[PDB]
Design a protein around this ligand. Structure first.
Ligand SMILES: O=C1CC(=O)N([C@@H]2O[C@H](COP(=O)(O)O)[C@@H](O)[C@H]2O)C(=O)N1
Ligand SMILES: O=C1CC(=O)N([C@@H]2O[C@H](COP(=O)(O)O)[C@@H](O)[C@H]2O)C(=O)N1
Lengths: 218, 217
């Protein structure tokens, strides 16, 4: 599995190139894995992945929550990996064929797929939560090795970890701004994803260092 | 929304030159183009403005928005800043995530299309069972534009029943995926067509043929 420095992944959702680069650079000594999503990509272009690689020694996880039909999913994954992303996050709710399409491209292109099971926001309780365990089991059956689960619901994150097993890689968003606790989350997840708590802080570096200090024993 | 010939072109070619050329070849048959991530991630968001400058067509950004409320808001803002007239959002992530999109759309004078049930086989695993409820959620939220499957006319009909005749419904799956244009238009206001047109030996002839088959509609 990828070796995530300090078990901390930066969710860089600033939409300004200058600010995104500044903040990422300031926390560079604490994080070597950055999650880049659509807020930044749709604002600055896919070349932002190239710029981050050039400026920082960081792995890039493209958080595109791929959720289309198989044919379109394949195209999205191809374009994303072509741009330099190490991995891509895919939704499991659209079904097995849609996930398989992503896995096939990742396999042929030498990259990785992360399967998003349950989400961290309140709305996730309406439809996603009830299908989450099955989505996770589907991922295991499909050979998925990387997963995403909610920091906001430790009880659910714990069950997801059981389903996927100790060998699978699990990252989790929701700590900080959304209310999740870093320490408790790391009891189940290999790494935590943190965005606003860091990038909106007066001193992002101090914020990142503070989070790391609170989980030093882990 | 007034869609010319009840036909929306799904421009999923991933090369700017080909995308512009093919769209130009069928421009006389359409005035609404659906641009998704295959083209946007390959050529950039500036492609949307290029389409509006060259064709003056309506642009529906098919981004299957499916994130938390906060991120959904940012995605919608970036998308409308690029000139998209509407955006397609997944309903599966819940009401709060859809509301986030509705708010930005209202603020920028755009429309949100709620994707209920999808057209591919995998949609039967989790989406189909929640589709009716997702549609009712749309009604409760005041959503007026929806997306339903051409590949399952019975499901498309049910969606139409739930949202009513006043709501706008567009439907993908006609052609390549097996759906029938005419049958789909019994329930949807407009059909989305991609490969059957953009992968045809003669895109213009393909579009003309589809329109000829639904002439009475
Ligand atoms: O269930 C999920 C999945 C996900 O990727 N995310 C993403 O994780 C990040 C969370 O950031 P933040 O720490 O709440 O600011 C954002 O980029 C979200 O889009 C989430 O919050 N919940
Ligand atoms: O359920 C759905 C939703 C959707 O947007 N789409 C999109 O509609 C288009 C269908 O294209 P095609 O006519 O099968 O080539 C693609 O851009 C898909 O991503 C779909 O096929 N099924």
């Amino acid at each position: 599995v990828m070796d995530v420095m300090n078990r901390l992944i930066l969710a860089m959702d600033l939409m300004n190139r200058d600010d995104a680069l500044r903040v990422t650079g300031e926390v560079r000594e604490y994080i070597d894995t950055v999650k880049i999503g659509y807020p930044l990509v749709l604002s600055e272009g896919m070349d932002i992945i190239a710029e981050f690689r050039k400026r920082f020694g960081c792995r890039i996880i493209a958080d595109f929550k791929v959720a289309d039909i198989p044919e379109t999913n394949e195209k999205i994954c191809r374009a994303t990996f072509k741009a330099g992303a190490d991995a891509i996050i895919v939704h499991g709710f659209p079904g097995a064929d849609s996930v398989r399409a992503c896995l096939n491209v990742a396999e042929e292109m030498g990259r990785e797929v992360f399967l998003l099971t349950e989400m961290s926001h309140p709305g996730a309780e309406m439809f996603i939560q009830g299908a989450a365990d099955e989505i996770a089991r589907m991922g295991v059956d499909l050979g998925v090795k990387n997963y995403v689960g909610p920091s906001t619901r430790p009880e659910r994150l714990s069950r997801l970890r059981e389903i996927i097993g100790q060998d699978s890689f699990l990252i989790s968003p929701g700590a900080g701004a959304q209310g999740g606790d870093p320490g408790e989350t790391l009891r189940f997840a290999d790494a935590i994803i943190v965005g606003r708590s860091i990038y909106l802080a007066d001193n992002p570096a101090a914020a990142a260092a503070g989070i790391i200090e609170s989980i030093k024993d882990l």
